[PDB]
Write an enzyme that holds these catalytic residues in place. Structure first.
Site, mmCIF file in Angstrom:
data_model
loop_
_atom_site.group_PDB
_atom_site.id
_atom_site.type_symbol
_atom_site.label_atom_id
_atom_site.label_comp_id
_atom_site.label_asym_id
_atom_site.label_seq_id
_atom_site.Cartn_x
_atom_site.Cartn_y
_atom_site.Cartn_z
ATOM 1 N N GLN A 8 0.884 -1.198 0.151
ATOM 2 C CA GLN A 8 -0.036 0.117 0.041
ATOM 3 C C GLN A 8 0.954 1.072 -0.012
ATOM 4 O OE1 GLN A 8 -3.403 0.159 -0.195
ATOM 5 N NE2 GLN A 8 -3.216 2.359 -0.328
ATOM 6 N N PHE A 9 0.604 2.136 -0.760
ATOM 7 C CA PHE A 9 1.264 3.449 -0.909
ATOM 8 C C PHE A 9 1.183 4.417 0.172
ATOM 9 C CE2 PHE A 9 1.238 7.739 -2.726
ATOM 10 C CZ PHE A 9 2.648 8.044 -2.718
ATOM 11 N N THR A 46 -2.914 4.028 -6.282
ATOM 12 C CA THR A 46 -1.875 3.291 -5.891
ATOM 13 C C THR A 46 -1.362 1.905 -6.564
ATOM 14 O OG1 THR A 46 -2.667 3.878 -3.399
ATOM 15 C CG2 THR A 46 -1.286 1.924 -3.696
ATOM 16 N N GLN A 47 -0.299 1.505 -6.706
ATOM 17 C CA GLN A 47 0.155 0.556 -7.334
ATOM 18 C C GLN A 47 1.252 -0.346 -6.715
ATOM 19 O OE1 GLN A 47 1.480 3.266 -7.784
ATOM 20 N NE2 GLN A 47 1.686 3.819 -10.025
ATOM 21 N N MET A 64 -2.607 10.165 -5.274
ATOM 22 C CA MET A 64 -2.658 8.621 -4.655
ATOM 23 C C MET A 64 -2.315 7.898 -5.722
ATOM 24 S SD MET A 64 -2.523 9.029 -1.292
ATOM 25 C CE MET A 64 -3.048 7.464 -0.633
#
Ligand SMILES: *[C@@](C)(CO)[C@](*)(O)[C@H](CC(C)C)NC(=O)[C@H](Cc1ccccc1)NC(=O)[C@H](CC(C)C)NC(=O)[C@H](CCc1ccccc1)NC(=O)CN1CCOCC1
Ligand SMILES: *[C@@](C)(CO)[C@](*)(O)[C@H](CC(C)C)NC(=O)[C@H](Cc1ccccc1)NC(=O)[C@H](CC(C)C)NC(=O)[C@H](CCc1ccccc1)NC(=O)CN1CCOCC1
Ligand SMILES: *[C@@](C)(CO)[C@](*)(O)[C@H](CC(C)C)NC(=O)[C@H](Cc1ccccc1)NC(=O)[C@H](CC(C)C)NC(=O)[C@H](CCc1ccccc1)NC(=O)CN1CCOCC1
Ligand SMILES: [Cl-]
Ligand SMILES: [Mg+2]
Ligand SMILES: [Mg+2]
Ligand SMILES: [Mg+2]
Ligand SMILES: [Mg+2]
Ligand SMILES: [Mg+2]
Lengths: 125, 196, 222, 226, 211, 51, 204, 195, 233, 195
Positions: C1-2, I1-2, I107
């Site tokens: 998760q970022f 997000t990746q 994001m």
């Protein structure tokens, strides 16, 4: 563990170790119990061979097991402490589990049961 | 890791890379993964460094005690002791081991013991993360009853490719030759095997 | 998760005098246990006799400063080159911060300058725009190490006058710029000893009616 | 922590920094990370501070009893074996990462040991948070057939790399040299490149500054005679 | 925080501490938790400092445009309701506000409790914050309607002191306000450190503490 | 601080145990206990191998 | 939830010229609630002083434990225990609970009766020793105390000067911590006299 | 259980404990006595998780009564409080800890002084002039901090207690069904039958 | 997000007296698989700037296209595109830094760490870092990923502070960079022997070196290492 | 909020609603009126999550008052209850539903009959002789099932309501601070000032 059978039968059907334990009682100081109409009195002998004794602190002969029951004895003094401790523990255990103090008959039956157990258990007199 | 053991005419040869990692960091670049449990019974270690060392040490103890009572143990016997440890403690271990040894009666033998604790007797075996990339190459190029020189080249070429593609493999190529003649250690450096 | 946030360390300190103000901060930039830069400026002259430092997450701090500098530029355009007072800047910064109430600027922020009566001023901000004028304030990694020292040595807290025994306090005498800079250097030297994210260098910006002056002092590099 | 170990001609040398942390806070600026297992077997420790001490004191105690039992000087491989089996048994929960070095009747030795019980052999090793900064130096300057003086220099240079570049490492450099046929020399604070500068001011207070409520004498002595 | 306010014969008393906290760390001790919306309106702050500050300052601007369009000062009820409706839009989104809107209008003294949960309550006595529970004991026991301004100011001050003593996240100094029909009147900043000892001696309270 | 009698009773019970179970020889020791507590004041006791 | 910060509290120790000082706050709390303002965290076993911060039940328990162990030490050794020796005993006792530790931050302070050398030491909850020359800190305001001690401290201070330094370090650190305060005590220790002073501080 | 209060005055200790027992959404009883007499001059009130409370109190009671019989002597309130604390400090690191908080009120006949001890389930002991467990102290401490003197009479202590209870009844959301009040002094333990 | 798929490891760089040096290996890893061996991660922009990129290669190729398009766009209606109004390292960096911070703020980041190396119009050295979070900093030496842990310590021994820059020659600086790349090959499990190196000097301009190899390696001592403790054979 | 009751008798509808407002461990108010007059002969009580309750009630009130002005006519209690239900059934599938349960008591002047409707937050409508929301009905329904007649007087309805409240006060753990009672009949809406 020490498992030796000390209390055993003899050819004539006697357990000598139990009978020799009665001789220790015979040696002990005299104790007497008399019940009246509304009371019970316990009398105990103190041998006067021992003077210079401090009567304040010397272990008394009559012991309270609970607030309503007492126990006196004759025989080995050190042995009596073990029975009294066990009886006191049982008295509190009975109050704790059944919410009533022990009857005199019950407490007696317990103490007597402990004495019996030590006549057919290995490694004990 | 990249480990292999190959039987040939005169006996058996073990081979391995020299890399041990902590994530992407190379904790040791000159590792010796070829370990001795008896005079002519060795093993290749893959998986947890702690687990494989603990196991190999226990096995060396068992075979040392075996020898004192019953004489030289067989390679099958050594593989059985490894198995017993890896199988019975499978929940708590991460060890992929190849057992290789030389008898005069049985000659060169190779046993592989993967994660579960199963045993598999084979003409040759490959294991470790880097082995995946050479299943095709090894299957195509392996022959039975090769010469010592042919077998060394086979292992050298195989581990060269495994090292080339696997990041978890690298350093030098160590080898251990097990024959009637004795025990020979070989080493091959990057400049030699990279140009193959 | 970022994870869109980070921690670049650093510590800052603002002290207001009677006719001056200082804004100090170490020059060290870090991630985890690595040093990125030993000299990466963190305190800026934003114009109109105002100095500012926003940091914690460097990227959010750089953006906030950049936006406030821009806000000053447009304040001149829109209001006839009028000087932006320190109290007006503070209120403006609150609104820059609360505009991201639901994706905050992850920073500690302090501005310093002079009020409209010429007296020194220091304003402190939380990440979402709660601001306070104060006489003394430290922010960042070692803020908790420094502030108690300043309560004692700037506001004379828990200090009483000998002979009276707790009956009469130590009187609040003002401090000079030279006395203040000593407290600043001692504060950062002490913080460098016990905090791993503090060190390398110390840059101080002093603000008077004459303008904005700089001073630089080395700190330990371990 | 940063810790290193370097072999040379007639022995081995180990070194360490002196910082101990508690999060981002420095708890001790002059911590002693070089531990004595036996007179000529020393180990440097990284990780959980209490664990590196406790595990070292324990194996050192058992090594002493072993040496007395066998009437022989203790070997490094014995300390190594006893440590790894102890750590393996606790499956990494004892967070001790050690570099074990020494001289014995077999010769000079240098090993590393991890918390899960794996050991490694080498001519140069490094452990701790600053191990990468230190290993960068070791890989750049190490050579075969080093002298004692060259090895001490290399080792302290490797620790310095950790001190300056790693936030988990700092303050001073400790060294211990173990040469064959000699007493081991423990060089506490071999380098001191991080002395604090003089403060600008003295914060000594006037007597009477602090407000007091009560005073009393504390009786530390025993019960007195007469 | 600890804040309180109560209606009485001669208007409404408003009192608050000044501590600001970030975990166990005391970040500030000089915070004004009473906001002056207009010369006849006060607002208290508890919970999110940023949240309370922003929304109550934005309310003060709503209350001002009201006065311009209508030639009439806004009522306490209308002001409290504008806030309540504003924060209701962001309900469940994370806002943390516990406020009291105190003032004097046409209906006399007014006092409304408003929070981020959605509550809006009119009442004669309120206290909000982590230390409110300690303050309520002193208020409820000594609160009358026929209270003198002098005695009412003391009650609100003494109530904060009680909370500041016990609650770890309350303290610093006491800010007092008295709202009349001629507007609010600031009654000073009182350091709890000094105030505690003073009250202890004069009142006799806090006997358990030594001094 | 432990009352004198309680300490004496405990040691005497240990001695007693060796006379009733375990199959071991008793302790060949007699003590004179001299002590003070706030209940009975100054006290002298003795114990012997019988417990 | 965090056992080390439920009850709150602080301890600090300092060395001086032929003297040591150890100080503590008096607060005991249940998180935000203040429960007692008389909860002293400094104990002594002969001439060796021990301050303990953290979980109050473990503070009380360890005091009773070290009183037990030092009373036996004395009966067998026929002498009072020294600070260096006591420090090892504390470390030993804490590490024996390595995987079920006491949630405490102990601090030892005292003067060796033979050499006359001042001695202080600190520990983590599992027994690691921090033997410092200057000062030791412990508690919920440990960060605050490190900042005060590191700037106010100077070596070779006289007893009456050391008193003011340690008192100001404690007081100003405690006033920046919500979980510390409600009174304070300072012990000034010399080779054969010990003075104990209660400080006047804000009660909030 | 819910509220237990304690106050030590000049010559006695007063313990006030709530009467309600609750299982979910239902009040099972409104006359529960949350206290056990440990000895003639020592009383212990308690509150915590169901079962644990009574099991622990009765276990302590049995141990103190056993001590009294064995020695023909009443333990001091300080000695009892120390015994209780050790049992709780022992309990907290056990497989399943007793979830119980107690107040021990006793009159020391040797020193002729009343004593009040507050002990929580962790084994945290403190001697106090007044104390409370759970959310009780939050409402009551401000009044006690204000009104309490150490030279108070028993009657003044009861009046201050009524004031504390009145505040609880006003601001607590939960109905605890009033309190049973007991006084511990030189003559022993007695219950205030009208409160 | 990746999550990053095909990745590039360390990029290292340093300032010297007349310019800057930057280097990066030619590998595109696919987890532990060393998939692509001919990947160029140094991308020149004009004759005065080199952008070194680590992290996700698909995002690198995207950035490479943005830069190529930036040059095209700068030339539009610009007679001084090859002179006064040419692209500067500071312009190129700020653009990237703007993009990186905007993408993290949506994001949806570009999963990279970037070092922009170059020489300005006035001859000043430019060296600045930016990553997926939009975090930026400058220093005499800069390195990404593992290089930050292993290369920086070695390069900081040459240029420890600003005043050491004029004292450092191009021969010394290149030597230090080449040594650091060797160390990373010893110790980084996601590195390759093959790498590219670029020098941007204010006098001699842009020199771009391809197909470099790590040489002068030490492995011979490995033969003497046997077992993991007790083993002798 | 906590308890809301309703009972339809011969010629009127009686609504009883608790007075307490609670924030955590503290009673903020003890005189809260949890009801809005929708029209002269229609009353709605309500209970649910803070904010949602009053926002919804006042929104309904505004809509019915708007209808009354536009048409110069009072909607039937049935029509109002149907409007309210639709708003709640619409709400339950929205981004953030109103967490509110209501009782609508009204006197239909056309049919000359009292009417009581129970509607929960899902939009579940039911016409009843008596009803309750939350944990209220659990205690009160057994008494209502026993004592209720449809020919009861308003005074008999109030006496039965007192009995219901007495049971709540005995067995509910939460103190709800009594109830405000309102009667809806032909002459309109009025509050019982003594209960
Ligand atoms: C190749 C690499 C892959 O099969 C080989 O098999 C070699 C075999 C030789 C060395 C025996 N294996 C390794 O290098 C091995 C790979 C590995 C990693 C993790 C689990 C199992 C296997 N590496 C290690 O065992 C290292 C050796 C240390 C550095 C000396 N150990 C670790 O990485 C330890 C192991 C802890 C562990 C985890 C899970 C299961 C068993 C053990 N891990 C760490 O120290 C954690 N580390 C630090 C924080 O970041 C995560 C990684
Ligand atoms: C470099 C400096 C860092 O990597 C070195 O590795 C040194 C090694 C030397 C000192 C032997 N390591 C440390 O300094 C080490 C870093 C660390 C921290 C946490 C876990 C592992 C390693 N620091 C410590 O071990 C300190 C030593 C103190 C300051 C004397 N101890 C702590 O930080 C303890 C951790 C105890 C622990 C228990 C169980 C498992 C792991 C660790 N933490 C605390 O005391 C924090 N807290 C304080 C309040 O009371 C509750 C606990
Ligand atoms: C009493 C004192 C406490 O209950 C009062 O209620 C006061 C009211 C006054 C200040 C108006 N409230 C506080 O002190 C309040 C408690 C609190 C904290 C966080 C959220 C809600 C309530 N404190 C704050 O608002 C502080 C004020 C600062 C110290 C000046 N602010 C912070 O802690 C900020 C705000 C954070 C935030 C809120 C909402 C969204 C995003 C962020 N946070 C930080 O500064 C970050 N924090 C720094 C300390 O280290 C941990 C991280
Ligand atoms: Cl290995
Ligand atoms: Mg490879
Ligand atoms: Mg530092
Ligand atoms: Mg405090
Ligand atoms: Mg407070
Ligand atoms: Mg307690």
């Amino acid at each position: 563990g020490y498992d030796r059978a000390l209390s055993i039968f003899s050819p004539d059907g006697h357990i000598f170790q139990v009978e020799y334990a009665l001789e220790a009682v015979k040696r002990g100081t005299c104790a007497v119990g008399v019940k009246g109409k509304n009371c019970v009195v316990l009398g105990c002998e103190r041998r006067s061979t021992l003077k210079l004794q401090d009567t304040r602190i010397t272990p008394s002969k009559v012991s309270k097991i609970d607030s309503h029951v007492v126990l006196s004895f004759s025989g080995l003094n050190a042995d009596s402490r073990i029975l009294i401790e066990k009886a006191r523990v049982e008295a509190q255990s009975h109050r704790l589990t059944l919410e009533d103090p022990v009857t005199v008959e019950y407490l007696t039956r317990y103490v007597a049961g402990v004495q019996q157990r030590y006549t057919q258990s290995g490694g004990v007199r | 890791t990249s480990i292999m053991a190959v039987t040939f005419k005169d006996g058996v040869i073990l081979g391995a890379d020299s890399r041990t990692t902590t994530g992407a960091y190379i904790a040791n670049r000159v590792t010796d993964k070829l370990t001795r449990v008896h005079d002519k019974i060795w093993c290749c270690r893959s998986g947890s460094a702690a687990d494989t060392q603990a196991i190999a040490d226990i096995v060396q103890y068992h075979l040392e005690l075996y020898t004192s009572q019953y004489g030289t143990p067989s390679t099958e016997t050594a593989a059985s002791v490894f198995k017993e440890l890896c199988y019975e403690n499978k929940d708590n271990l991460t060890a992929g081991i190849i057992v290789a040894g030389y008898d005069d009666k049985n000659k060169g033998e190779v046993y592989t013991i993967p994660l579960g604790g199963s045993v598999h007797k084979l003409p040759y075996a490959i294991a470790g993360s880097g082995s995946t990339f050479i299943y095709g190459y090894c299957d195509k190029n392996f022959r039975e009853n090769m010469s010592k020189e042919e077998t060394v080249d086979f292992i050298k070429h195989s581990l060269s490719q495994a090292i080339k593609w696997d990041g978890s493999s690298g350093g030098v190529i160590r080898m251990v030759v097990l024959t009637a003649a004795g025990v020979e250690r070989l080493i091959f450096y990057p400049d030699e095997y990279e140009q193959l | 998760q970022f994870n869109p946030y980070g921690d670049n360390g650093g510590t800052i300190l603002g002290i207001a005098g009677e006719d001056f103000a200082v804004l100090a901060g170490d020059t060290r930039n870090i991630t985890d246990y690595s040093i990125n830069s030993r000299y990466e400026p963190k305190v800026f002259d934003c114009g109109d006799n105002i100095v500012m430092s926003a940091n914690g997450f460097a990227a959010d701090g750089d953006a906030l400063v950049k936006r406030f500098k821009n806000s000053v530029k447009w304040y001149h355009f829109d209001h006839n080159d009028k000087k932006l007072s320190i109290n007006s800047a503070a209120r403006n910064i609150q609104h820059l911060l609360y505009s991201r109430r639901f994706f905050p600027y992850y920073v500690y922020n302090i501005i310093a300058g002079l009020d409209e009566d010429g007296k020194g001023a220091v304003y402190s901000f939380d990440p979402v725009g709660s601001y306070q004028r104060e006489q003394c304030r430290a922010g960042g990694a070692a803020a908790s190490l420094i502030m108690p020292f300043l309560d004692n040595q700037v506001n004379f807290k828990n200090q009483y006058e000998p002979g009276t025994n707790g009956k009469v306090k130590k009187p609040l005498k003002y401090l000079s710029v030279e006395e203040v800079i000593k407290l600043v250097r001692d504060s950062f030297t002490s913080a460098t000893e016990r905090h791993i994210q503090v060190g390398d260098g110390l840059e101080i910006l002093i603000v008077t009616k004459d303008g904005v002056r700089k001073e630089f002092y080395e700190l330990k590099r371990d | 922590t940063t810790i290193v170990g370097v072999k040379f001609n007639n022995g081995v040398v180990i070194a360490a920094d002196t910082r101990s942390t508690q999060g981002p806070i420095v708890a001790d600026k002059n911590c002693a990370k070089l531990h004595r297992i036996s007179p000529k077997i020393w180990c440097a420790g990284a990780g959980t501070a209490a664990d590196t001490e406790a595990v070292t004191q324990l194996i050192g105690s058992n090594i002493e009893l072993h040496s007395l039992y066998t009437s022989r000087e203790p070997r490094v491989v014995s300390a190594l074996q006893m440590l790894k089996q102890h750590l393996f048994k606790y499956q990494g929960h004892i967070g001790a990462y050690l570099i074990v070095a020494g001289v014995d009747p077999t010769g000079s030795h240098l090993f590393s040991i991890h918390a899960h019980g794996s050991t490694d052999v080498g001519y140069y090793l490094s452990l701790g948070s600053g191990s990468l900064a230190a290993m960068a130096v070791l890989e750049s300057h190490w050579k075969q057939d080093l002298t004692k003086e060259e090895a001490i220099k290399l080792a302290s240079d490797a620790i310095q790399a950790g001190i300056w570049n790693d936030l988990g490492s700092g303050s001073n450099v400790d060294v211990c040299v173990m040469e064959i046929g000699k007493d081991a020399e423990y060089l506490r604070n071999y380098l001191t490149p991080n002395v604090r500068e003089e403060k600008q001011k003295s914060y000594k207070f006037p007597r009477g500054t602090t407000a007091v409520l009560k005073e009393s004498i504390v009786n530390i002595c025993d019960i007195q005679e007469e | 925080t600890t804040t309180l306010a109560f209606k009485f014969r001669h208007g409404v008393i408003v009192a608050a501490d000044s501590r600001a906290t970030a975990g166990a760390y005391i970040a500030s001790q000089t915070v004004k938790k009473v906001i002056e919306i207009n010369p006849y309106l006060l607002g208290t702050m508890a919970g999110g400092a940023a949240d309370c500050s922003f929304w109550e300052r934005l309310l003060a601007r709503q209350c001002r445009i009201y006065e311009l369009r209508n030639k009439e000062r806004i009522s306490v009820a209308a002001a409290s309701k504008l806030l309540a409706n504003m924060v209701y839009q962001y309900k469940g989104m994370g806002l943390s506000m516990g406020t009291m809107i105190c003032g004097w209008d046409k209906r006399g003294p007014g006092l409304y409790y408003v929070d981020s949960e959605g509550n809006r309550i009119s009442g004669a006595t309120f206290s909000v914050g982590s230390g409110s529970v300690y303050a309520y004991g002193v208020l409820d026991s000594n609160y009358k309607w026929d209270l003198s301004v002098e005695d009412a100011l003391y009650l609100g001050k003494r109530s904060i002191l009680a909370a500041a003593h016990r609650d770890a996240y309350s303290g610093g100094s006491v800010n007092l306000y008295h709202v009349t029909e001629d507007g609010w009147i600031y009654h000073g900043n009182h350091d709890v450190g000094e105030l505690f000892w003073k009250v202890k001696e004069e009142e006799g309270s806090f006997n358990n503490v030594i001094g | 601080d432990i009352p004198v009698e309680i300490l004496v009773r405990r040691l005497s019970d240990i001695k007693q145990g060796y006379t009733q179970h375990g199959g071991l020889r008793p302790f060949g020791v007699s003590f004179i206990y001299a002590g003070y507590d706030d209940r009975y004041g100054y006290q002298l006791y003795t114990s012997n191998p019988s417990g | 939830s965090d056992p080390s910060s439920i009850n709150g509290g602080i301890v600090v120790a300092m060395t001086g010229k032929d003297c040591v000082a150890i100080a503590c706050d008096l607060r005991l709390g249940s998180q935000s609630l203040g429960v007692s303002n008389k909860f002293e965290k400094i104990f002594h076993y002969g001439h060796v002083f021990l301050g303990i911060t953290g979980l109050a039940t473990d503070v009380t328990t360890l005091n009773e434990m070290f009183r037990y162990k030092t009373n036996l030490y004395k009966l067998k050794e026929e002498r009072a225990i020294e600070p260096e020796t006591f420090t090892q005993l504390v470390s030993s006792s804490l590490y024996e609970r390595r995987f079920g530790p006491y949630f405490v931050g102990p601090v030892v302070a005292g003067i060796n009766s033979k050499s006359g050398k001042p001695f202080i030491a600190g520990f983590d909850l599992i027994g690691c020793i921090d033997e410092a020359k200057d000062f030791i800190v412990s508690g919920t305001a440990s960060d605050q105390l490190f900042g005060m001690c590191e700037s106010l401290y100077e070596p070779n201070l006289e007893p009456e000067d050391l008193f003011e330094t340690i008192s100001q370090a404690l007081l100003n650190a405690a006033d920046r911590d919500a979980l510390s305060g409600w009174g304070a005590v300072v012990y000034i220790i010399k080779k054969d006299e010990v003075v104990k002073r209660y400080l006047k501080m804000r009660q909030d | 259980m819910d509220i237990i209060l304690g106050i030590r005055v000049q010559d006695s200790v007063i313990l006030a404990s709530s009467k309600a027992v609750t299982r979910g959404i239902s009040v099972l009883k409104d006359s529960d006595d949350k206290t056990r007499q440990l000895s003639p001059h020592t009383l212990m009130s308690f509150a915590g998780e169901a079962g644990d409370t009574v099991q622990f109190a009765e276990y302590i009671q049995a141990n103190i009564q056993l001590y009294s019989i064995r020695e023909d002597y009443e333990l001091s309130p300080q000695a009892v409080s120390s015994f209780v604390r050790q049992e709780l400090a022992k309990s907290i690191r056990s497989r399943r800890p007793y979830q119980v908080n107690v107040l021990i009120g006793g009159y020391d006949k040797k020193k002729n002084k009343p004593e009040l001890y507050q002990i929580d389930y962790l084994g945290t002991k403190v001697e106090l002039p007044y104390g409370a467990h759970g959310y009780s102290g939050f409402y009551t401490f401000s009044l006690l901090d204000h009104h309490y003197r150490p030279d108070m009479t028993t009657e003044e202590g009861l009046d201050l207690l009524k004031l504390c209870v009145q505040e609880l009844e006003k601001r607590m959301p939960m109905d605890f069904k009033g309190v049973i009040v007991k006084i511990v002094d030189k003559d022993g333990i007695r219950q205030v039958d009208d409160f | 997000t990746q999550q990053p798929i095909v990745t590039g490891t360390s990029v290292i760089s340093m300032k010297y007296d007349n310019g800057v040096i930057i280097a990066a290996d030619n590998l595109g890893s696919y987890g532990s698989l060393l998939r692509f061996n001919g990947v160029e991660r140094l991308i020149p922009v004009g004759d005065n700037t080199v952008v070194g990129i680590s992290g996700d290669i698909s995002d690198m190729q995207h950035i490479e296209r943005l830069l190529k398009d930036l040059v095209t766009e700068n030339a539009y209606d610009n007679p001084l595109a090859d002179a006064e109004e040419a692209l500067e390292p500071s312009y190129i960096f700020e653009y990237l830094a703007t993009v990186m911070y905007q993408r993290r703020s949506k994001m949806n980041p570009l999963w990279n760490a970037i070092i922009v190396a170059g020489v300005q119009s006035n001859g000043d050295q430019f060296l600045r870092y930016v990553n997926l979070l939009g975090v930026t900093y400058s220093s005499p030496t800069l390195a990404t990923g593992f290089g930050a842990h292993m290369a920086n310590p070695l390069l900081r021994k040459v240029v420890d502070r600003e005043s050491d820059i004029p004292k450092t020659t191009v021969q010394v600086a290149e030597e230090a960079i080449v040594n650091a790349m060797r160390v990373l090959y010893y110790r980084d499990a996601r590195s390759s022997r093959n790498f590219s190196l670029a020098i941007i000097d204010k006098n001699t301009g842009l020199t771009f070196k391809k197909n470099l190899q790590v040489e002068n390696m030490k492995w011979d001592f490995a033969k003497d290492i046997k077992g993991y403790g007790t083993q002798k054979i």
